[PDB]
Scaffold this active site. Structure first.
Site, PDB file in Angstrom:
ATOM      1  N   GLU A  97       0.862  -1.183   0.000  1.00 56.73           N
ATOM      2  CA  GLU A  97       0.000   0.000   0.000  1.00 56.73           C
ATOM      3  C   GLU A  97       0.899   1.234   0.000  1.00 56.73           C
ATOM      4  O   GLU A  97       1.927   1.191   0.605  1.00 56.73           O
ATOM      5  CB  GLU A  97      -0.831   0.059   1.284  1.00 56.73           C
ATOM      6  CG  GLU A  97      -1.785  -1.124   1.437  1.00 56.73           C
ATOM      7  CD  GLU A  97      -2.848  -0.844   2.541  1.00 56.73           C
ATOM      8  OE1 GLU A  97      -3.627  -1.788   2.844  1.00 56.73           O
ATOM      9  OE2 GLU A  97      -2.911   0.343   3.064  1.00 56.73           O
ATOM     10  N   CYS A 123       1.468 -11.123 -17.608  1.00 54.20           N
ATOM     11  CA  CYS A 123       1.781 -10.262 -18.772  1.00 54.20           C
ATOM     12  C   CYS A 123       0.577  -9.802 -19.556  1.00 54.20           C
ATOM     13  O   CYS A 123       0.776  -9.180 -20.602  1.00 54.20           O
ATOM     14  CB  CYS A 123       2.703 -10.987 -19.746  1.00 54.20           C
ATOM     15  SG  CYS A 123       1.868 -12.490 -20.481  1.00 54.20           S
TER      16      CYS A 123
END
Length: 338
Positions: A97, A123
């Site tokens: 975070e 990907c």
């Protein structure tokens, strides 16, 4: 359910500044190659990777995404105040975070209505991010979206290589590290928009996705350890694309005489060769940067798209297939009409 009013308003990429040759790397691998009895130059002669790029030493993924984002906004002819969504799609993330999207947003100066979050999907995530933005745009919730992706492999080289100093590395372990030594740094960003705001800009149709999540164990990757079954990744990767191409025939009308460029995520020269041959694709319609940049993860597709643009190789009306097979396994195939 293709998209009717979604276009690509801007697109840019950043090449990372430092060249790391496979030659330099091979000088650090040599003792391990020797102890294992291997004489093959696996990077350069088998994967086909001669070089990849690295960022300055303390560059963050968010710094690279931010630069690309600023260039894409220029490309798009708009300022940050118009952006109502910013999605980060990278594998590289600054922290747990806050999200990398938050950091890029803050750097750029988005306004208090901009929605931000990260998406992650090996990907393919850049295509996922496009689709997420496209649905908001198509619905009219926002006018412009950024999709951004900065990838940093610096730490992967430092750790991976430092593991080589070790008498202890087994061949199975070395073979996974060689795969890590195909990854590269780079970044890209794309401004998407409602079509009426950018007439004559490329149009994003959307696409199709198939999955084979029964195969999620075929690889596992952290900074600490990567394990793979490269035989079944290849075999099941290709069956999955066969299935997904059949969906794109049906929903996008794809056929070999209809497609002008294939912008494909690449894992190695011989993998891309197998793929191109298995599907009867003209290797001249498949741009590759793998030789000098390696595999830049989910950024690879938009970086290649951006490099085709900047070379002047894309013409109005060109039908461009974006595609990738990502671990999971998942396969996504989407179309841009330039």
């Amino acid at each position: 359910m293709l998209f009717q009013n979604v276009s690509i308003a801007g697109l840019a990429h950043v090449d990372a500044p430092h060249t790391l040759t496979s030659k330099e790397i091979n000088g650090r691998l040599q003792p391990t190659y020797d102890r294992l009895g291997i004489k093959t130059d696996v990077l350069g002669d088998v994967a086909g990777i001669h070089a990849r790029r690295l960022w300055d030493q303390d560059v963050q993924a968010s710094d690279a995404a931010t630069q690309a984002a600023r260039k894409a906004l220029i490309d798009a002819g708009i300022g940050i105040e118009k952006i109502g969504l910013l999605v980060n799609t990278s594998v590289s993330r600054d922290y747990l975070e806050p999200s990398t999207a938050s950091i890029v947003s803050g750097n750029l100066g988005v306004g208090d209505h901009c929605v931000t979050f990260d998406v992650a999907n090996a990907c393919l995530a850049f295509i996922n991010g496009m689709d997420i933005a496209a649905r908001m745009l198509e619905r009219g919730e926002i006018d412009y979206a950024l999709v951004v992706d900065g990838e940093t492999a610096n730490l992967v080289y430092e750790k991976t290589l430092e593991r080589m100093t070790s008498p202890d590395v087994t061949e199975e372990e070395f073979r996974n590290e060689l795969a890590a030594l195909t990854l590269g740094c780079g970044a890209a960003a794309m401004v998407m928009a409602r079509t009426e705001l950018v007439p004559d800009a490329p149009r994003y149709k959307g696409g199709v996705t198939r999955s084979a999540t029964e195969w999620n164990k075929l690889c596992r990757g952290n900074l600490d350890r990567m394990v793979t079954d490269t035989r079944l990744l290849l075999i099941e990767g290709i069956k999955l694309a066969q299935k997904t191409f059949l969906a794109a025939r049906q929903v996008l009308g794809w056929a070999v005489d209809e497609l002008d460029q294939f912008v494909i995520h690449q894992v190695s020269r011989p993998h891309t060769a197998a793929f191109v041959k298995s599907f009867g694709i003209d290797p001249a319609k498949v741009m590759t940067i793998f030789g000098e940049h390696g595999n830049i993860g989910p950024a690879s597709v938009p970086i290649v798209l951006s490099k085709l643009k900047e070379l002047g190789r894309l013409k109005k009306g060109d039908r461009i297939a974006l595609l990738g097979i990502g671990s999971g396994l998942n396969c996504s195939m989407a179309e841009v009409v330039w």
